[PDB]
Amino acid sequence: CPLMVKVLDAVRGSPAINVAVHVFRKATWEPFASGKTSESGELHGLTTEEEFVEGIYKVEIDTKSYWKALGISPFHEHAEVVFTANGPRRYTIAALLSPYSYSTTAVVTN
Amino acid sequence: CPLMVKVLDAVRGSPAINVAVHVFRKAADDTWEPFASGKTSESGELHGLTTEEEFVEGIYKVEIDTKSYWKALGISPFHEHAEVVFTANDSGPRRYTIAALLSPYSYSTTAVVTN
Numbered sequence: 765c766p767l768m769v770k771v772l773d774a775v776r777g778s779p780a781i782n783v784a785v786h787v788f789r790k791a792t793w794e795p796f797a798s799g800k801t802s803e804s805g806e807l808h809g810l811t812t813e814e815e816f817v818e819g820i821y822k823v824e825i826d827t828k829s830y831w832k833a834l835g836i837s838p839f840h841e842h843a844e845v846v847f848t849a850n851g852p853r854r855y856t857i858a859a860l861l862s863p864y865s866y867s868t869t870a871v872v873t874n
Numbered sequence: 875c876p877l878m879v880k881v882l883d884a885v886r887g888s889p890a891i892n893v894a895v896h897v898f899r900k901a902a903d904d905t906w907e908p909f910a911s912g913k914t915s916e917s918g919e920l921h922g923l924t925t926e927e928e929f930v931e932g933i934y935k936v937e938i939d940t941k942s943y944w945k946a947l948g949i950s951p952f953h954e955h956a957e958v959v960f961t962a963n964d965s966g967p968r969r970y971t972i973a974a975l976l977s978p979y980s981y982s983t984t985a986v987v988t989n
């Protein structure tokens with residue numbers, strides 16, 4: 765699956781590999797799911813259809829550790845994507861990373 | 875003008891007017907303390923958030939209220955807000971502009987930092 769995250773690197777022109785991603789649900793922010801992106805920049809298996817209910821969620825991507833592992837100077841502490849989950853749907857949260865910028869979009873399909 | 879925020883609307887090709895922006899600063903006990911807030915002008919700009927004296931080193935969070943912006947235009951958006959979190963002033967004072975470009979299911983942000 766219901767929730768997937770995909771992260772891309774705009775400097776190197778590649779998937780962003782081995783990035784830590786934490787997901788929280790709003791209760792204060794309670795930990796819900798986490799993982800590290802794969803060689804393709806994707807993180808699957810975060811949750812299940814049963815666990816992923818409507819509500820407010822935050823996806824926190826540890827962009828600062830990523831850029832430090834590449835020896836590139838970053839601006840942000842992390843990137844955070846906060847959204848409301850409201851028929852049948854799959855959510856992809858995608859992010860494109862640069863040292864002083866990031867962009868995010870949601871892909872929501874049936 | 876050590877901290878400025880600029881917001882644009884990618885659907886209408888316009889400044890994003892009357893957008894609420896809240897700034898927080900991380901406290902010693904690791905919670906977020908209110909720091910400053912304001913609303914964007916007719917030009918999409920928000921100046922006058924803070925001063926050189928109040929804008930000390932720290933970890934700051936700028937929360938731009940994109941959900942209320944879209945709902946006022948009659949649109950149901952995906953995100954609650956757009957957030958930017960960064961360490962400021964670590965090597966002395968700098969001037970920061972935080973810019974954001976909005977669509978209903980997407981946003982992008984960039985920082986422009988000058989000495």
Ligand SMILES: N#Cc1c[nH]c2ccccc12
Pocket residue numbers: 770771772858859860867868869
């Ligand atoms: N994945 C992803 C993206 C997030 N923002 C973009 C901008 C251009 C192309 C791809 C994406």
Ligand SMILES: N#Cc1c[nH]c2ccccc12
Pocket residue numbers: 880881882973974975982983984
């Ligand atoms: N303002 C602003 C922006 C935030 N992200 C951008 C991407 C392209 C052009 C402008 C902006």
Ligand SMILES: [Ca+2]
Pocket residue numbers: 796797798
């Ligand atoms: Ca879990």
Ligand SMILES: [Ca+2]
Pocket residue numbers: 931963964965966
């Ligand atoms: Ca310092």
